[PDB]
Amino acid sequence: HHVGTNTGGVLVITDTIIVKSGQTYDGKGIKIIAQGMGDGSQSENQKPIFKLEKGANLKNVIIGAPGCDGIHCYGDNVVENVVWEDVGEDALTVKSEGVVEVIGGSAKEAANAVFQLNAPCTFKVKNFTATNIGKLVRQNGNTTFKVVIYLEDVTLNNVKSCVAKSDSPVSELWYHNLNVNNCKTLFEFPSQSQIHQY
Ligand SMILES: O=C(O)[C@H]1O[C@H](O[C@@H]2[C@H](O)[C@@H](O)[C@@H](O[C@@H]3[C@H](O)[C@@H](O)[C@@H](O)O[C@@H]3C(=O)O)O[C@@H]2C(=O)O)[C@H](O)[C@@H](O)[C@H]1O
Ligand SMILES: [Ca+2]
Ligand SMILES: [Ca+2]
Ligand SMILES: [Ca+2]
Numbered sequence: 275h276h277v278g279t280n281t282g283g284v285l286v287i288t289d290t291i292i293v294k295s296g297q298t299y300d301g302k303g304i305k306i307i308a309q310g311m312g313d314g315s316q317s318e319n320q321k322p323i324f325k326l327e328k329g330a331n332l333k334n335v336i337i338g339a340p341g342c343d344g345i346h347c348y349g350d351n352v353v354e355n356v357v358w359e360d361v362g363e364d365a366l367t368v369k370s371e372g373v374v375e376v377i378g379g380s381a382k383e384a385a386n387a388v389f390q391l392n393a394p395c396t397f398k399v400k401n402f403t404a405t406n407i408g409k410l411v412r413q414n415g416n417t418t419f420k421v422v423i424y425l426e427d428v429t430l431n432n433v434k435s436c437v438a439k440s441d442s443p444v445s446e447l448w449y450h451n452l453n454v455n456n457c458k459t460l461f462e463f464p465s466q467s468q469i470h471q472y
């Protein structure tokens with residue numbers, strides 16, 4: 275394990291970091307603390323720590339409290355080795371269509387959702403651990419567009435509500451090596467047949 279060269283530094287930001295199409299923000303292990311951008315509560319008016327334009331990537335950051343509105347993904351994004359020490363309103367939101375992959379990293383202390391899917395997308399969570407969360411994934415309530423969610427090598431502990439929840443009959447969730455401890459219910463979808471193993 276080559277810990278990153280920014281390990282032990284703390285970057286204090288006062289505005290959202292915008293990552294551009296085709297760019298990769300590599301924190302090299304930096305911890306980020308956002309100020310004036312939200313308190314990490316459930317209020318819906320906080321700023322994202324990062325905005326990933328379509329085709330932007332992010333890797334190797336620690337997001338400290340306050341988690342604000344987390345990471346906003348506009349599609350075709352890879353988010354690797356991101357650690358949310360204390361999820362804010364939500365950890366990451368898919369805002370526009372495309373494939374979004376969360377690979378590695380972890381999240382803790384999500385009062386409500388970790389991942390919030392507000393546009394049709396393919397959403398994959400791989401090699402990920404989350405602890406003390408309300409939900410891992412929420413498709414925006416009362417929407418009926420299609421998401422396809424993959425949970426692969428995912429370990430969850432203390433899930434207050436459910437692993438994932440969608441109000442869309444056409445959405446699907448697929449899982450493979452999913453470990454869940456202390457969870458109220460696994461899936462809240464219109465029908466359980468929308469959930470598959472692979
Ligand atoms: O992108 C966002 O942050 C998103 O947040 C709100 O919606 C989510 C969710 O999509 C809604 O279904 C709703 O969730 C329900 C409750 O209001 C919530 O407190 C918790 O109990 O879960 C419920 C559920 O899953 O059905 O509200 C969510 C939230 O409060 O984060 C916005 O309504 C939405 O417009 C958007 O900003
Ligand atoms: Ca919420
Ligand atoms: Ca919300
Ligand atoms: Ca949010």
Ligand SMILES: [Ca+2]
Pocket residue numbers: 314360361362382383384385
């Ligand atoms: Ca929190």
Ligand SMILES: [Cl-]
Pocket residue numbers: 385386387407408409434435436
């Ligand atoms: Cl919840």
